[model samples]
Target chain A: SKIAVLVVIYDHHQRELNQRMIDIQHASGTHVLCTTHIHMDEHNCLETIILQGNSFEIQRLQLEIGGLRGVKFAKLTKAS
Target chain B: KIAVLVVIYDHHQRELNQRMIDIQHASGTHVLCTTHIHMDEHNCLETIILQGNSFEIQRLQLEIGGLRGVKFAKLTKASSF
Candidate 1:
């Protein structure tokens, strides 16, 4: 199945976080199907990402992404 | 091309989903992708990232905003890439 995760990050570390995400995706065999970045306001930026994987693998990827220092908020929106 | 992020709360799931699907197909736009998740017990948030003609995007946004229980919906012209 596919999973949807929301990652919140600051503008300053966007590059670092983006690279980390690609690395994490490679490590888990999770393919990032779609990602869209939205600037909520001046300081807060949001990314809505959908990944394709089995349920458990998707959950693991979310945890790894959430654990990164660059990520402000990492949330698993839906997994099936 | 544009993207629309729509959030709806406190509504019938099947009805809203069907209507949204119908509207999306008829809106003459391409949905890059969509992510829908339950924000809370009673609220479901749907974020749609689509790209197409500006007018189609606007029409889709307007139609969705007037749907049954839409609390907030906005279109973004700012490109992420």
Candidate 2:
């Protein structure tokens, strides 16, 4: 089974926080299908990422990202 | 080909559905599948799989995203063809 999810990562620590997400994307088998960036201000932004992968892997990846420093929330939108 | 995920206020459900169908017909595109889920009392999420000309799909996205009460609308390119 494959799944799609929407993840919003809070950008507070800037570089360090965003880098952490890159690391997670590399380590986990998470495929970023598409992404859009929402800039709140000079120091804040929200990353909207659409991810695709194995159903279980996607859930696990969301959990891991949600636990990271700058992640605000991760919600699975659709699965098949 | 693209898959669009739309989030909108549930109160506008009827209006949005009609608008979406009209847009689809105007663009000559087909909605492969649409799955709707209630996110909360005020919000609803719809995942729609659409296939047609890339330009038309993107245009429809812009139109739908600009609708009143729509919270989020984003599309993922599903194929090169």
Candidate 3:
């Protein structure tokens, strides 16, 4: 019914961060429709994710990802 | 959350406002941000930032896209804690 497109910027040292996020999202029954990674700079990178799930589930995922050690910013850029 | 870009005919302002109100009711929160620019005499481009479940976001986009004068709708997803 809705899709959450999340933009994640994190410290680049967290090489496994993407997999960790995917696992957490899967554990909650959310589907990752797409993912794009962009090199932001030497210390950081940006990952954009398209997620399909309910509103609550998306929020849960956002919160979970935000709490990770190397995450600098995890926020909802848009939804619909 | 995600940011959605919506393009609409100027005449659909009423429908746009209605959609925002409906989304607030459905999700129990308002859109995070809304910025618009006049693209031309006939079109207005709006950028909306929203936080909610993926489904609610899609619902909002579909509602706006289905309005009589909407021309385009797209979104970018991101995360920040």
- Judging by DockQ against the true structure, name the best candidate: 1
- What is the descending lDDT order? 1, 3, 2
Question: A12 in model 1: Cα distance from truth in Å?
Answer: 15
Best model per TM-score? 1
* Per-prediction DockQ: 0.11, 0.05, 0.08
Query: What are the TM-scores, per candidate, against the unseen true structure?
Result: 0.52, 0.49, 0.50
Could you give candidate 2's per-residue lDDT for residues A1-80 as a string of tens digits?
Answer: 45365645365655687877778877778787656665544555545565667777777777777787655555555543
Model 2 chain A: lowest-lDDT 10 consecutive positions = A71-80
RMSD of each: 9.4, 12.7, 11.7
- Please provide, for model 3 over B11-81, each residue's C-alpha lDDT reduced to its tens digit, 9 standing for 90 to 100: 44566656655654665324665555554465565556566667777777777667666666676555444
Model 2: lDDT equals 0.62
Best-performing candidate as measured by lDDT: 1
Binned by DockQ into CAPRI classes (incorrect, acceptable, medium, high), candidate 1 is incorrect
Q: Clashing residue pairs, candidate 2? A: none
Order by TM-score, highest first: 1, 3, 2
